[PDB]
Amino acid sequence: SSIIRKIINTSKAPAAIGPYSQAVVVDRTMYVSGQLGMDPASGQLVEGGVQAQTKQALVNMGEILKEAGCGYDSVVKTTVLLADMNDFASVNDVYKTFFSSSFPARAAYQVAALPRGGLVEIEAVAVLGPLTEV
Amino acid sequence: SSIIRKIINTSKAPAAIGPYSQAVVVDRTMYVSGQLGMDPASGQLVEGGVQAQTKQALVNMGEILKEAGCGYDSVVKTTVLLADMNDFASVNDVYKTFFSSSFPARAAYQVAALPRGGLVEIEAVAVLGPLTEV
Amino acid sequence: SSIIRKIINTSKAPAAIGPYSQAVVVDRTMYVSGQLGMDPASGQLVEGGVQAQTKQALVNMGEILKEAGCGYDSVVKTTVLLADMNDFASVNDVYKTFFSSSFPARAAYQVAALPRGGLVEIEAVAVLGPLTEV
Incomplete structure (x- = not known):
């Protein structure tokens, strides 16, 4: 009855x-921090605007998921x-290129400002597989 | 040890x-998307302002909960x-007419803008019953 | 298979x-409402600005965690x-004085406005121990 973190x-x-x-x-549930469109090497926001930043944020999310043994199909909820x-x-x-079916639940809204002046930030909840779809 | 989604x-x-x-x-946990005050048939925001939109958003939430076999009493957290x-x-x-006792945990805040120019958006986490209150 | 709330x-x-x-x-998962920097006795926001309010919000969070048998080390996700x-x-x-290692996952952003004109609001997800770190 001891939960692994x-x-x-x-x-x-x-x-x-x-x-x-x-x-x-924690156990099988993974809380993913808000991902910004930052290059992993320089830490700077990528150039080219909101689509470029969204792509980079979701690539970053994917690397974090993979480190935990998960993929994009493990994501059950995001906030954009x-x-x-x-x-x-x-x-x-x-977004739909990363989450292309059995889409996560989601909330989306415009905030006043994001860290570093980012154009997009995406957080997530994922569940560590195996997952059975019903 | 395979989790049902x-x-x-x-x-x-x-x-x-x-x-x-x-x-x-996923298992017994239900992540409900941000609900807007949209008519299910036309997809348009309902007329009459913020209370009308809040009511419709929560009616929409209720239909989603019911589809999963849950009711408003299953909700444990919302964001307004x-x-x-x-x-x-x-x-x-x-809100308190839908969640009238054993209230969900909640966060609430003003955002810069919502999809479609909505006045309110409400997301939720629910747990599929049976639930025992202690 | 009945979940305790x-x-x-x-x-x-x-x-x-x-x-x-x-x-x-619900079971071992605790959803903590958005905490404002309010004095528990008067309900008013504390004086002195954003650091004072952040401290009070996190002290308030700590009292709620303790009431459930948890501490700051039980927190797995926050939103600032x-x-x-x-x-x-x-x-x-x-924030880092309350969460000083094995930090929660987090999202942070500027909103348009908070209840009561607060400068900061912090919500959380915690897991009731015992917790094992791996």
């Missing part, structure tokens, strides 16, 4: 920019935080 | 306006996202 | 300012909601 850390995703872990696993609501459709177009 | 979908609530499922059940903080009391008055 | 309530933290419980425990993104570093300095 694992702090997930991989250099394949950027170092946290504050006092947080990239993700925390935008700097500009006008970007919803552009963000959705990128 | 169920994508929840009912035409009694609006179709998702983006690449997300209305809700996802507002277009206008001046609406907190009006939203609370509606 | 416990509504957490302690006068050592402020009374909820809306129709929500301070926290809800700011009135001003310029406060990220100041908030982080306070």
